[PDB]
């Protein structure tokens, strides 16, 4: 038939990158044969680029109707349904296809993918493994399974797995195919900086293809601030305006911009989540736009053009909810990345990338497709100073006879409560109040031991640190500063009283075998020391425990605690002594949380930006001695902190002061420096100069 010849031509032209002039080929084939089952399928498959989301569904349904045994249509339709948010149906599409064709590997891969998205990681691993058995040469399932194993810290045959992934990327990079490793995942695998940037470029090119269908003309960009009253118009685009780590770091910056010279636009790709974070940004920002009601990217980008944004800030990168297609349209002259994606976009539409020397040294350049944007001290900023000001000062209880990490008390009204106490003693490190083991301490201890929610002492509210959720739900989330006094103790989390507490509250995926070995060596060299981790996920606990047993560490040497609300999670940091940063993916936000707690953090900067973070932090903090230059230096620094107690006290004191003295948590300072950089870039663009590294 003539339809078959048209079909084959269309497929070839599709591989030829001529989908624009190949979809027409598919169309002609369908016109020749209206009921061409195969032609209906593929034409929708190319439609999966974006086109009309339901347009693909129409062709897929017709293809399945014409040939009820077309398992390719079923699995593809399920994926198309996945983009449409119809999980209930996409799952049924995959299973429908699997039941028809049990040997269909792709359906098992997609079934595992949705399980993985839903969080049933073990089931995603199982289905992925079933897909690989059916089709071992299947990069997508392997990479996803490798990611799943990384998430649960399953390092069985780890090295070869890593090597296999690099080989897959090479082959897929040779053929210009879509790499199976997500650019966010690239930071977790040992790949050359070129490979990672190439993967980001390929993902960045994906949105370009889906925007060409609009054929939207170029966007006329302003060349002066005259139309804006000399005010630079900056639009912060993010889908995380709400209870998300991005908001917990920068919710204050929008309000801190100097309105005399700046006009702040907050474009939200997410609906209002009813959190005080969204409330704050919607109120303090000069303008807030819910692009979540503007699905069409062209429509949204056009709206950005109308507002007159001079600098557009991408706070998503290749994270969930990102709508980078809007940035592809170049709605603003200057476009730059900011917090949220710890990596390069590899895309032309991103002109700049905010960083700092330590985070992105000049030598580590060429790893970024974007021109570098220098931030005087650090690119990372935190709102802990505002979210948890009750942690600025703390108090302890003398259980035996100067322990600052066993029985700690926090509270805004702490000063008045202490003044009501008869025998308060002061230990100078400004200084730390200490409660002697008296009847008041006895009442507090009974509260903790009995697990009582709260007590009253001289009319003061005393809250058990583990029951903040039911005492004030808003406070536990960090939306509200607790209006009570909170008691936190090692006994709450089973930490040994007279023991060194090494901690790392990052997600377990940031842990790799070499990092675990380093920490194991630390524990062996430091007696009476324990490692404090989080069930995050909880399935990683057995894997970590087994690898410790193989490393010679008894079970009791590692203590696992469940994840806790933001306020409780940050409050627990005081209980520990030193935090061990994950060198593979330096704890970025978790590093801020621990530092606010006053807990020293030992880090080993790497080659990637994500690895180099938390070094910039420590640098800006003024605690350079906690940055290790190699594996041995990391081990030695951690071991000294655990053994030289006087050194630990001095370092913890320095962290305690620098967290407030150093311009690390000074949001107003950060905003002003950000405003400076903003201007610098504009001048460059005003004088016609194209993006060039700002340092």
């Amino acid at each position: 038939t003539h339809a078959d010849s048209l079909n084959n031509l269309a497929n070839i032209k599709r591989e030829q990158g001529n989908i624009e002039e190949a979809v027409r080929l598919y169309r002609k084939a369908l016109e020749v044969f209206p009921e061409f089952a195969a032609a209906h399928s593929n034409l929708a498959s190319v439609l999966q680029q974006q086109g009309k989301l339901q347009e693909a569904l129409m062709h897929y349904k017709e293809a399945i109707r014409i040939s009820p045994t077309f398992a390719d249509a079923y699995s593809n339709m399920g994926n198309t349904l996945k983009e449409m948010q119809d999980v209930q149906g996409a799952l049924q599409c995959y299973t429908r296809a699997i039941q028809i064709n049990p040997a269909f590997a792709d359906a098992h891969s997609n079934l595992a993918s949705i399980h993985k998205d839903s969080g049933n990681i073990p089931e995603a691993i199982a289905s992925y493994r079933t897909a690989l058995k059916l089709k071992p040469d299947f990069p997508d399932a392997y990479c996803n399974l490798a990611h799943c194993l990384q998430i649960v810290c399953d390092w069985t045959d780890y090295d070869e797995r890593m090597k296999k992934l690099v080989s897959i990327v090479a082959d897929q990079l040779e053929k210009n195919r879509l790499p199976s490793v997500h650019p966010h995942h690239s930071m977790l695998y040992p790949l050359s900086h070129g490979f990672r940037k190439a993967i980001a470029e390929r993902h960045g090119n994906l949105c370009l293809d889906k925007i060409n269908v609009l054929h939207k003309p170029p966007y006329e960009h302003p060349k002066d601030l005259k139309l804006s009253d000399g005010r630079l118009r900056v639009g912060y685009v993010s889908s995380d305006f709400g209870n998300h780590p991005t908001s917990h770091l920068m919710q204050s910056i929008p309000g801190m911009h100097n309105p005399d010279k700046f006009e702040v636009f907050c474009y939200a790709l997410s609906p209002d989540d009813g959190t005080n974070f969204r409330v704050k940004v919607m109120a303090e920002a000069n303008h807030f736009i819910d692009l979540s009601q503007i699905p069409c990217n062209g429509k949204a980008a056009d709206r950005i053009h109308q507002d007159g944004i001079h600098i557009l800030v991408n706070m998503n990168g290749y994270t969930k909810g990102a709508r980078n297609e809007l940035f592809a349209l170049r709605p603003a002259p200057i476009q730059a990345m900011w917090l949220g994606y710890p990596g390069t976009s590899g895309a032309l539409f991103m002109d700049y990338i905010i960083t700092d020397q330590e985070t992105s040294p000049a030598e580590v350049a060429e790893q970024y497709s974007e021109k570098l944007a220098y931030m005087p001290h650090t690119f990372f900023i935190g709102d802990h100073a505002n979210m948890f000001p009750h942690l600025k000062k703390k108090a302890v209880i003398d259980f035996k006879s100067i322990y600052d990490n066993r029985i700690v008390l926090n509270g805004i009204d702490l000063k008045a409560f202490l003044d009501s106490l008869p025998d308060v003693k002061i230990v100078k490190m400004l200084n730390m109040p200490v409660i002697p083991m008296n009847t008041i301490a006895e009442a507090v201890i009974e509260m903790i031991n009995r697990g009582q929610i709260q007590i009253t002492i001289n009319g003061f509210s005393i809250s058990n640190g583990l029951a903040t959720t039911q005492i004030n739900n808003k406070a536990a989330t960090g939306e509200e500063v607790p209006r009570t006094i909170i008691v936190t103790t090692r006994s709450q989390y089973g930490l040994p009283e007279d023991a060194i507490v090494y901690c790392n509250f990052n997600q377990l995926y940031k842990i790799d075998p070499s990092t675990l070995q380093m920490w194991a060596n630390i524990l062996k060299r430091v007696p009476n020391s324990v490692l404090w981790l989080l069930r995050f996920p909880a399935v990683g606990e057995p894997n970590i425990q087994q690898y410790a047993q193989n490393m010679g560490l008894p079970q009791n040497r590692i203590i696992f605690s469940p994840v806790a609300p933001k306020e409780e999670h940050v409050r627990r940091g005081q209980l520990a002594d030193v935090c061990l940063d994950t060198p593979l993916c330096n704890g970025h936000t978790t590093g801020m949380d621990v530092l606010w707690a006053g807990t020293p953090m030992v880090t080993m900067p790497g080659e990637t930006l994500a690895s180099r973070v938390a070094a910039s932090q420590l640098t800006c903090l003024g605690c350079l001695e906690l940055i290790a230059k190699n594996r041995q230096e990391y081990e030695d620094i951690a071991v000294k902190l655990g053994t030289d107690l006087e050194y630990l006290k001095k370092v913890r004191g320095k962290v305690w002061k620098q967290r407030i003295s150093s311009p690390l948590f000074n949001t107003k300072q950060y905003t002003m420096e950000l405003e400076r950089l903003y201007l610098q870039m504009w001048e460059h663009y005003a004088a016609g100069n194209k993006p060039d590294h700002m340092i």
Binding site: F399, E442, I445, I448, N449, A467, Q492, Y493, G494
Partner: peptide, 11 residues
């Protein structure tokens, strides 16, 4: 229930 992992001895 919902108490500390271990108790704290006290005279």
């Amino acid at each position: 229930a919902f108490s500390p992992k271990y108790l704290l001895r006290l005279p």
